Design a protein around this ligand. Structure first.
Ligand SMILES: Cc1[nH]c(/C=C2\C(=O)N=C3CC=C(C(=O)N[C@H](C)c4ccccc4)C=C32)c(C)c1C(=O)NCCN(C)C
Length: 502
């Protein structure tokens, strides 16, 4: 439901308005041609207007398919790529990969196939595009078109930008609404934080901590920040909407009490990927519990509620007795200095709870006081059942190792050590990260599962506006980019991109 005049709101400015952008946007190849969704498409569209560059984009696409191809189908896919792109007589032959690299990857196919067989070549491809072609694109109309899209992206985000609908629950420091962008019609979840309730509790730094952590991480398995803006009496965080219900609901109301191992495997795998993306920013979630794992319309999960998350200064540890009773790792209960390790304890708690239908330290039918739950977490050894395979028992107690130094994933290798565990022996994480694995459960779309100045300065740092990557993804999902990104007939400069007549 895009506003009747959405084409006027997203109307491209004249290229002459973007001059200040042209000389401030850093010209990084990976940023303008890969990370940024709309730049990526534009550069790919530039290469589509040249004969020599065309085959280089097609080859990268086919290598992407190779990586997610099933194992038994890998030798077949590999041969096709070579006969098509790496044959000297092919019409779309890749040339910058020297003859001493096509004759090399030929041997990898003469042997067993690996999912990274073409990773060597693909890099040689990007090394060529980073050079001449990238600098030609920079002086093409497609980059001028990119500058226009950036100009729109940086437009101020007000309250008429959105359209509030309902209250999707609530929590502390505010409530969560469901909002829609009038111009594109995309649904988000607005996290409205009462302005006067923040100053009173004196928790200003905790509000920026969450906003800054959300905008810096872009993961398929963590709620993504798309906008942040101030308003009268509230500060808002526009986040990914999740209509599939939380994991606590599905463990207890909709599962046995619990799930099958294979089903928990899927959710555990996605949660482990979420945590890995956070850890790449040396950030700890510290708040793993079933009700913070939400499900979307398709059955995939995202971590939510980064309010207790913090960015660890690299090479340093932190202190903080924070979390929920029963989901706090020993180092946290003891108020020790820890790193990322609480998040791998929490992953243990979830795999266990998913499979058994109760916490590993408190029964579903047990009346127990907090202190006894903490004692257990610190001293007692959890017990497993026939619901767990030996592999499942292993990863759970490895992750529930009370000594954070001996705990799985709490080493130099990190999440990779956990993905290698026999528990995920049958989980192809590459196909998972690409969304190609069907979720186990699919929700139904119809279900129901005061005038100071120091405060002014605190708002400017928070109300940064739209987030770059999520905003561009919004333009693409709603097909606003497909509709507005129109050039002139037969490779002609459209009026907006021609400096002769504004
Ligand atoms: C659709 C929907 N969204 C959500 C919720 C979310 C979401 O989607 N994204 C996000 C991202 C981040 C949070 C988050 O920080 N929270 C914490 C606790 C919080 C902290 C401070 C203030 C308020 C809240 C929540 C959400 C819920 C429950 C339903 C829901 O289940 N509503 C009942 C009927 N539904 C089936 C339609």
């Amino acid at each position: 439901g895009k506003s009747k005049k959405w084409k006027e709101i997203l109307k491209f400015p004249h290229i002459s308005q973007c001059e200040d952008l042209r000389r401030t946007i850093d010209r990084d190849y990976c940023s303008l041609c890969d990370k940024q969704p709309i730049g990526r498409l534009l550069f790919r569209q530039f290469c589509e207007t040249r004969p020599g560059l065309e085959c280089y984009i097609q080859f990268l696409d086919s290598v992407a398919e190779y990586e997610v191809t099933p194992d038994e189908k890998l030798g077949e896919k590999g041969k096709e790529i070579m006969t098509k792109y790496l044959t000297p007589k092919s019409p779309v032959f890749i040339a910058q990969v020297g003859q001493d690299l096509v004759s090399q990857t030929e041997e990898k196919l003469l042997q067993k196939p690996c999912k990274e067989l073409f990773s060597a070549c693909a890099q040689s491809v990007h090394e060529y595009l980073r050079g001449e072609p990238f600098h030609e694109y920079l002086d093409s109309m497609f980059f001028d078109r990119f500058l226009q899209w950036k100009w729109l992206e940086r437009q101020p985000v007000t309250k008429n930008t959105f359209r509030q609908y309902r209250v999707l629950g609530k929590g502390g420091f505010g409530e969560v609404c469901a909002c829609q962008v009038r111009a594109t019609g995309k649904m988000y979840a607005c996290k409205r934080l009462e302005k006067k309730r923040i100053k009173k509790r004196k928790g200003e730094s905790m509000a920026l901590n969450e906003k800054q952590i959300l905008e810096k991480v872009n993961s398929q398995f963590v709620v993504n920040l798309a906008y942040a803006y101030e308003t009268k009496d509230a500060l808002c965080l526009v986040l990914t909407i999740m209509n599939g219900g939380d994991l606590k609901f599905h463990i207890y109301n909709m599962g046995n009490p619990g799930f099958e191992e294979e089903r928990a495997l899927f959710y555990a795998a996605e949660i482990l990927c979420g945590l890995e993306d956070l850890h790449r920013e040396n950030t700890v979630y510290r708040n793993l519990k079933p009700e913070n794992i939400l499900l979307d319309d398709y059955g995939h999960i995202r971590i939510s509620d980064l309010g207790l998350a913090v960015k660890i200064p690299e090479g340093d540890l932190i202190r903080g007795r924070v979390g929920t009773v029963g989901y706090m790792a020993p180092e946290v209960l003891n108020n020790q200095r820890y790193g990322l390790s609480p998040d791998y304890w929490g992953l243990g708690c979830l795999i266990y709870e998913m499979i058994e239908g109760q916490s590993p330290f408190r029964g579903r039918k047990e009346k127990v006081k907090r202190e006894e739950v903490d004692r257990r977490v610190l001293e007692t050894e959890e017990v497993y059942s026939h619901k767990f395979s030996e592999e499942a028992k292993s990863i759970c107690k490895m992750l529930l190792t009370k000594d954070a130094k001996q705990r799985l994933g709490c080493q130099e290798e990190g999440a990779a050590e956990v993905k290698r565990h026999p528990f995920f022996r049958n989980m192809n994480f590459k196909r998972l990260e690409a969304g190609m694995l069907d979720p186990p459960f699919v929700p139904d779309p119809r279900a129901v599962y005061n005038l100071d100045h120091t405060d002014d300065d605190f708002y400017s740092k928070f109300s940064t506006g739209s987030v770059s990557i999520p905003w561009q993804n919004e333009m693409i999902e709603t097909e606003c980019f497909k509709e507005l990104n129109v050039f002139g007939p037969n490779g002609t400069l459209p009026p907006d991109l021609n400096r002769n007549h504004p």
